[PDB]
Design a protein around this nucleic acid. Structure first.
Ligand code: MG
Length: 123
RNA sequence: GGGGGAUACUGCCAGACUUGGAACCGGGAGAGGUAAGAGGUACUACAGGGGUAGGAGUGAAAUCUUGUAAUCCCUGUGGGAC
């Protein structure tokens, strides 16, 4: 019974995923949108997220881990705040890969009043 | 310009009257003001540990950034705004 935690940085342009142990100071598997898929336009797709979850599940099985919690985050703060579409797709692809999922937490770093939000309002 | 009559009216004279404003007390309300301090989270700087082919961004791209190990993750120490 080995427990791991997968970090999913889901954006509107990418959904990088890295898998660590409980302490988090050691990583096991990692794969971003462009790590396996060669199109930047399709790096944030749910199909790319399921491909990343599948290609991480076999490495997790090789390392000896069958269950991972999910710590999903958006960029957060002075950028995009809500989680992207790749989070639920990655977690469902992990659950369909055989890897059990327990707790899933949305841990996007939320600022109360952080630095100045870069934006153009209408543009 | 100057005389007589009137006293409502307004201006003059001396009080008063409490409603108008002014002053004080009571339990409450308020992102009211200055002064001081602490705090919240995020960000960021460097350093350390893990890990290894891209991260960022776009309508799509490229500059930019990354093999001097970035992205992501963990630890720690400072930073200024908010
Ligand atoms: Mg403009």
């Amino acid at each position: 019974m080995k427990w791991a935690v997968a970090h999913i940085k889901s954006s509107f342009n990418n959904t990088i995923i890295t898998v660590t142990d409980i302490t988090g100071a050691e990583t096991i598997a990692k794969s971003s949108g462009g790590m396996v898929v060669k199109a930047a336009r399709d790096e944030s797709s749910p199909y790319t997220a399921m491909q990343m979850a599948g290609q991480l599940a076999d490495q997790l099985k090789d390392k000896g881990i069958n269950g991972i919690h999910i710590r999903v985050r958006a960029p957060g703060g002075n950028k995009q705040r809500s989680p992207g579409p790749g989070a639920q797709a990655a977690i469902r692809a992990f659950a369909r890969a055989g890897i059990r999922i327990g707790r899933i937490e949305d841990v996007t770093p939320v600022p109360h009043d952080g630095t100045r939000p870069k934006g153009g309002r209408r543009v």
